[PDB]
Write a protein that binds this ligand. Sequence first.
Ligand SMILES: Cc1c(NC(=O)c2ccc(C(C)(C)C)cc2)cccc1-c1cn(C)c(=O)c(Nc2ccc(C(=O)N3CCOCC3)cc2)n1
Ligand SMILES: [Ca+2]
Ligand SMILES: [Zn+2]
Length: 429
Amino acid sequence: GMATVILESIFLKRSLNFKKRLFLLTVQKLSYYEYDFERGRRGSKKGSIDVEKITCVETVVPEKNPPPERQIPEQISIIERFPYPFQVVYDEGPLYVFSPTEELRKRWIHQLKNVIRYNSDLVQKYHPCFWIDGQYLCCSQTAKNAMGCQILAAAPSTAGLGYGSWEIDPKDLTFLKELGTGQFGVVKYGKWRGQYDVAIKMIKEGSMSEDEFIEEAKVMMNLSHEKLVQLYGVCTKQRPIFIITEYMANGCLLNYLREMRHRFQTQQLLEMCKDVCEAMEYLESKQFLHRDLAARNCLVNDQGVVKVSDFGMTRYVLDDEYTSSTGSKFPVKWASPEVLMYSKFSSKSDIWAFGVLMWEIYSLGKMPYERFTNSETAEHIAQGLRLPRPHLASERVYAIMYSCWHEKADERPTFKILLSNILDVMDEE
Ligand SMILES: Cc1c(NC(=O)c2ccc(C(C)(C)C)cc2)cccc1-c1cn(C)c(=O)c(Nc2ccc(C(=O)N3CCOCC3)cc2)n1
Ligand SMILES: [Ca+2]
Ligand SMILES: [Zn+2]
């Protein structure tokens, strides 16, 4: 996955002694340390739990008589008063943590519950109350590893798509239609447990760095936005492996644009841009690059909503004709000059590509730089060649896409700024 800290908070931890600890969560580990107040950083490490060993995270029933420091009834209190407990359940008994606020406890529980979907020894039951004086107060059982006495409200074993085990059973898939092929081979439409529509990407053996994708899915499983194609899970206990996603009935945006019968109004085209920009603002906020943003990599559902697809997947492509910046399959005509010249990938190369995508949308799927080959494009865009204003784009709309192609990456806007510009034009109309 990634070594990035997803959540950082100061909590009160129970050993019976209670101590303030800085908790840091990564997809790999939940670690806690003494808090270096003076330096505003972590102090000495005091322990850690491997995320793969966590079987359950849930609230705890509060103690009936907790001292003032833990009594339910801003700056000073949020680091001195900890009344809301939660438990992290793993092999070595539960770990009890007290949050200063309810919102913060909710945030940690929500995040941890999603993360542990990846794990293999998940439980359906837990202990609602504290283990104290050699027994659980809820059921009076005397073993710390005693099975939970109460079923979880949304136990993963019985949870629906997006909340269940990350590994999906392929025997629960029905295949109904061929959706064509892409960089990793065949894709199909089908049903999960006979009711839920899904897309099944079947990974051609030898096309993907599978072990890296499977591990790194720990990060991608946390990406969720209304305008991102949702990843539901994987099937990796067979050959080939499958990637299971949200199904988009209308296919890829590029082919959608090229279907002349739609006869889109320019308001509809701007809405497509807004959809994509919202997805990209979300990915930018998670410091996650797409690296092949283009109309061909966006999909359209049966409601006409555009969503961004296959973000982050370039990293696992084994084909050097795709990966090489001069390869026949590399997306040269969406690549910023710095990418082509120096392999300088950043949020700003995604911004460049977004501009070309806006141009595609207002050109109804025309090939960019049609008069030029990939090699010619690479040479001339580094000199200052730019895509001209599409006939359907107003000067104001063109200014947005044009801003994406500044020769200096740092003078390119962010997706937050682009979205603001798009919303302004929608109002102005
Ligand atoms: C994403 C995708 C690829 N492309 C890839 O898998 C791919 C892999 C890697 C990359 C990188 C280069 C970035 C690494 C890019 C793309 C190839 C084929 C289909 C789909 C796809 C997916 N989903 C989630 C749908 O809902 C859907 N829905 C469709 C719905 C309808 C139709 C359609 O109109 N059809 C089907 C066949 O022909 C008849 C009409 C087609 C697709 N189509
Ligand atoms: Ca269609
Ligand atoms: Zn119990």
